[PDB]
Design a binder for these strands. Structure first.
Lengths: 432, 165
RNA sequence: UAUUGACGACCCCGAUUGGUUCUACUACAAACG
RNA sequence: ACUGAAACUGUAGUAGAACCAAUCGGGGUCGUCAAUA
């Protein structure tokens, strides 16, 4: 029995609204109509695990112990947008109460005594947690040029402000996983289209997205189609899932409101940024973290500045960020490839090519990438898979060369061979 | 109506908010479905292909109205409007509206005015004694947001009929 | 016919996309040797 | 020229998959203003 569980948002933080956009793969700009918003429960929010199990057998099932282990590992995901940043939950303070409803003393204990407490650690010792095959990629990046996703609307003292999220009782700068996934998908697709020399200009945005290997890795929209009598969903969830990224740098929910509600860049904004950066008495040190930047458009005949075209960015020039965490469900891919572990190698090869570009500054992230922002420096990529198939196990590596040369050459050549075999005939690799 | 102390007053109030919220939403759809009602409520109008103001100026307002969670946040929207009004080029962006900047000022600062525009008869929708006064005080900011969102959507989709020829 | 005689800042964000597509009940228990 | 009794509208089913809050913009720069005598 699974009960409905009310969510307690920490303190009384309100729901966040998260903006979303589809970026046209030809023009590189927001696709028409593809502008959306999702209300999301913050992070740190708590809800009950409301579970009851009626046992007819004696003891507690192994599969159910494995489930509770996965909850404490944080391996189950809940809700929408599981690949695009959301849905990770972790169980804490698991309690097991047992009632022997088969016997008088246990039935009265159900009525009166609130049950026998079982030590979870005893069952947790009897079992080994059978975590499914997955690859986890953790990327350590420092912004080279300021990096920020744009906040949902223009501020007063500053027009363009960084996006923030509630992370417990504090606000942190966030790079949505929707954003890291769209840039990775965009480069993944560009690689595929480059090899096949396949243009994206005539396709609409839903068609632009739908190209091979990325449909399995990054996922494809649900779309039932009659093939011939048979009816097939073209949709599949992404095997690749990215988690929202957060800064080392946190502020109290009001400290940031002091910045959002500042009205004069040289006035009350200066205390707000000095407060929020943690340098209340060093505007210099404060502005080596969050720097207001004025920009003009200069009229081409007159010079000076174009009427109205004065705007300001709060550039997070010195915000430090947490590692980006990507999660490849190898088990989900293997299901798409109908169990064939040999079909993994092109998807793995693509993903490593996307990571080679990410490390080589070929993928900028966030707002303003062409306009002075968004360049990242990747100093380490840590590939850390569990229960990988034996030929993919050389992925278990901490890479620091951008060009993947920390992976064994015999493994990179094996991937390159399967990659080249796919390039020679780029079939829909999950069709059988 | 229920006595104010009645034990089911809390439960009844959940039914009331639901009936009020969905009433406000359906009426906002209806009011936004006519261009005369959009021009009356916000001053927003179509002038051929043109929108007064441009959709970008409506989007700016609508992005500020997202912050109107309560009547203690009407200072946020009045802050935006005074900043807009204090900049001559941005104020002129709203000329050829039917007095849209003051219509927005009123809707955000006259608490009765959203209810005057909605003009919902809430008597079939309330059962708690003092239900109307409390729900109006509770659902005000949501009603403002709901009506403006509907108006701006109905505006843009009537603009598409004039603009996309 | 061409003189009188020096002062003074401005711009403060602008334009746009604001949802798109799929799933809309499926098996049952009552029917039928 | 005597009320039928007894019987949970329940069981299985993740409102989800796909979607970059993004595109463009040197914090820039010279002669105007007033009308007569």
């Amino acid at each position: 029995i699974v009960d409905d569980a009310v969510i307690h948002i920490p303190n009384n933080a309100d729901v966040e609204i998260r903006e979303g956009v589809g970026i046209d793969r030809h023009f590189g700009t927001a696709a028409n109509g593809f502008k959306y918003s999702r209300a999301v429960i913050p992070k740190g929010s708590k809800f009950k695990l409301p579970l009851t199990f009626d046992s007819q057998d004696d003891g507690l099932p192994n599969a159910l112990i494995q489930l509770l282990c996965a909850l404490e590992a944080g391996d189950i995901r809940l809700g929408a947008a599981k690949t695009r940043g959301l849905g990770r939950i972790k169980l804490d303070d698991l309690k097991l109460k047992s009632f022997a409803l088969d016997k008088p003393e246990g039935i009265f204990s159900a009525l009166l005594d609130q049950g026998k407490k079982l030590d979870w650690n005893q069952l947790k010792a009897n079992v080994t947690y059978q975590s499914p095959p997955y690859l986890g990629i953790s990327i350590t990046w420092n912004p080279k040029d300021p990096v920020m996703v744009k906040a949902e609307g223009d501020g007063l003292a500053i027009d363009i402000l960084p996006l923030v999220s509630q992370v417990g009782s504090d606000v942190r700068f966030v790079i949505p996983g929707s954003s890291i996934k769209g840039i990775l998908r965009t480069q993944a697709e560009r690689i595929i289209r480059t090899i096949c020399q396949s243009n994206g200009s005539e396709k609409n945005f839903l068609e632009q997205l739908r190209i091979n290997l990325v449909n399995e890795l990054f996922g494809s929209a649900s779309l039932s189609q009659k093939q011939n009598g048979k009816d097939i969903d073209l949709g599949k969830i992404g095997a690749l899932a990215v988690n929202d990224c957060f800064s080392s740098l946190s502020m109290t929910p009001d400290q940031w409101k002091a910045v959002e509600n500042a009205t004069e860049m040289t006035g009350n904004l200066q205390p707000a940024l000095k407060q929020a950066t943690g340098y209340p008495n060093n505007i210099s040190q404060a502005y080596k973290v969050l720097q207001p930047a004025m920009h003009v458009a200069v009229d081409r005949w007159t010079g000076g500045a174009a009427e109205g075209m004065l705007y300001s960015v709060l550039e997070p020039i010195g915000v430090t960020w947490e590692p980006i965490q990507v999660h490849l469900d190898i088990a989900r891919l293997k299901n798409y490839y109908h169990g064939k572990e040999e079909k993994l190698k092109p998807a793995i090869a693509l993903l490593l090519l996307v990571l080679r570009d990410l490390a080589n500054k070929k993928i900028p992230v966030g707002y303003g990438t062409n306009r002075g922002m968004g360049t990242i420096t990747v100093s380490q990529i840590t590939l850390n898979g569990k229960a990988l198939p034996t030929e993919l196990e050389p992925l278990n590596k901490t890479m620091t060369c951008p060009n993947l040369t920390d992976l064994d050459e015999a493994f990179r050549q094996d991937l390159s061979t399967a990659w080249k075999e796919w390039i020679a005939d780029p079939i829909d690799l999950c069709q059988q | 109506p229920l006595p104010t102390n009645h034990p089911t007053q809390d439960y009844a109030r959940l039914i009331e908010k639901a009936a009020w919220r969905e009433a406000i939403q359906n009426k906002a759809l209806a009011l936004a479905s006519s261009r005369a009602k959009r021009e009356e409520i916000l001053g927003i109008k179509i002038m051929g292909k043109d929108s007064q103001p441009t959709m970008t100026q409506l989007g700016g307002f609508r992005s500020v109205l997202k912050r109107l969670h309560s009547r203690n946040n009407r200072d946020i929207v009045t802050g935006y409007l005074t900043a807009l009004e204090q900049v001559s080029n941005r104020k002129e962006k709203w000329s050829n509206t039917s007095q849209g900047l003051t219509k927005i000022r009123n809707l955000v600062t006259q608490e009765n005015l959203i209810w005057n525009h909605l003009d919902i008869d809430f008597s079939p929708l309330t059962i708690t004694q003092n239900g109307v006064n409390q729900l109006k005080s509770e659902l005000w900011a949501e009603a403002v947001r709901t009506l403006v969102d509907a108006i701006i959507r109905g505006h843009k989709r009537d603009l598409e009929k004039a603009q996309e020829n």
